Write a protein that binds this ligand. Structure first.
Ligand code: VLD
Ligand code: VLA
Ligand code: TMP
Lengths: 264, 264
């Protein structure tokens, strides 16, 4: 996508060498922002093939409040295998914080239901926010949240959303993350009778791993194709009642996949 | 400052007219980012005189972990008077979360102590974060945090910081917010023997109140002047031992102050 390849070129042109946990080695910049108008098309990267079925199933899993990979395995999705413990558990990562953030006084807050009711009843609110950054539970999580905090906004009948991503593997993780939140915006907008607005992506430590550079330059040699279109085929009674089959992506004509090694 | 005046002009030109919680009305945009290289100068707005007395005391108050305005009054700082209760209390707002975020199990995390230890021990970490957005205590706060989340970053011996501000009064609040976090960067860099890098400001709902328009037009007619330089006159034993007398701003030649009514 034009904005995504510009970001890749910016990391390459302006980034600095940085180690990670012992680890692999990165090139990193700090601070970036880009905007996808979702009325232009669904922002699924076209300069390499991406696995949308995994994106959809992961988001439905988050929305259920699940943090065990059993559901993902029942749908042949392996993207979390490397972080799960021997029972398939990840600890209280995204889905648990979204649906049941634990308070100090024994309550749990369903932030997704909260922002659905704000969008329906108080869309001018300046605090329609979901955070996964539960400081007091980070030590129980298999990974600290990368897509850590997000905010919705309504204007002119359109729903927008801004994500703060504190750490971002630009080659492997970011295509998935963009498509995931874009999908969530469409579902929310459907539930609240709004049109889609912008997805605004903001990055903290935004980096390319050193073993992804030949793959990154291969992708950069390619011309983006027209964006695909997202069609939702049903209006479920709640944001938690969507099914994989309710979604169809039309016109996705990507360049070939590019394989790259994960950095656990 | 150039970037600040460009943002003000952008809200005027592109902002949407919104009813807000106060009944005042705003012009608002969603999603913006600015970057201040702290080696170019300290980013204190020069197109109106900003009073650093209140900024410094409020930051020292945060760092104490204090959420009662008594300390502020003892120093003739009144910026929190409206929202406090008859005892001076604000609930568990910024100071409490920075210094003693409560876990669900009755422990606490000192996020400032943690960040100092990360900068000194693990400066390449991608999770050097302080969050005031404690979902489970928002109900107890007098006001939901506006400067909600910030992240530090170290590259080539320089300390950078990025703030996510979910709601931004561009005219009254933003000059203070920028200066406050720029000051914290200088203080942490001093304690960690680092040089200062960038302060990156990221906004969510970024707005101008409808009774600030005369003041905005006045300020947009003024040419910015070269930024001042911050001097810290003493190095304290810790980030928790600074005093107002430690700070000097040299070469600050602002245009006159501009008075505007605050939306409660
Ligand atoms: N209107 C208002 N302005 C604030 N700055 C502000 C507040 N309320 C709530 C308390 C706390 C106190 N800090 C201050 C800071 C500066 C002043 C002030 O009036 N200074 C004058 C006098 C100088 C002097 O006396 O020496 C001068 O500079 O000459 C007063 C209070 N802040 C800060 C806070 C909040 N907001 C906004 C965004 C939304 O408009 C709204 C939230 O509303 P909501 O939850 O989104 O619905 O507060 C921000 O944009 N940046 C934030 O850091
Ligand atoms: N170092 C590092 N990199 C990351 N990307 C990363 C982590 N660490 C920690 C945990 C996660 C989980 N989410 C995801 C991680 C990776 C992918 C991913 O690699 N997608 C591939 C093919 C997917 C398939 O069909 O199985 C393709 O799109 O081609 C998708 C989601 N992300
Ligand atoms: C879950 C997830 C991880 N990641 C990457 C970011 C980091 O490189 C790495 C997280 O490790 P970290 O805790 O050291 O930042 O995984 C993404 O980029 N997007 C995602 O959604």
């Amino acid at each position: 996508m034009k904005q995504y390849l510009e970001l890749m070129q910016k990391v390459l042109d302006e980034g600095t060498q940085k180690n990670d946990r012992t680890g692999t080695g990165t090139l990193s910049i700090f601070g970036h922002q880009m905007r996808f108008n979702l009325q232009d098309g669904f922002p699924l990267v076209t300069t390499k093939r991406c696995h949308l079925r995994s994106i959809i199933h992961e988001l439905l899993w988050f929305l259920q409040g699940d943090t065990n990979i059993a559901y993902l395995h029942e749908n042949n999705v392996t993207i979390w295998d490397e972080w799960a413990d021997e029972n398939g558990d990840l600890g209280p990562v995204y889905g648990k914080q979204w649906r049941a953030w634990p308070t100090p006084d024994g309550r749990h807050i369903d932030q997704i239901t909260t922002v659905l009711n704000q969008l329906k009843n108080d869309p001018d609110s300046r605090r329609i926010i979901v955070s996964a950054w539960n400081v007091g539970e980070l030590d129980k999580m298999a990974l600290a949240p990368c897509h850590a905090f997000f905010q919705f906004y309504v204007a002119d009948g359109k729903l927008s959303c801004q994500l703060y991503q504190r750490s971002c593997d630009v080659f492997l993780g970011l295509p998935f993350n963009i498509a995931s939140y874009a999908l969530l915006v469409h579902m929310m907008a459907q539930q609240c009778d709004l049109e889609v607005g912008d997805f605004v992506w903001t990055g903290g430590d935004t980096h390319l791993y050193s073993n992804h550079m030949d793959q990154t330059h291969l992708q950069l040699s390619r011309e983006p194709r027209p964006l695909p279109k997202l069609i939702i085929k049903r209006k479920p009674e709640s944001i938690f009642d969507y099914r994989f089959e309710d979604f169809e992506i039309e016109g996705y004509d990507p360049h070939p996949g590019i394989k790259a090694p994960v950095a656990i």
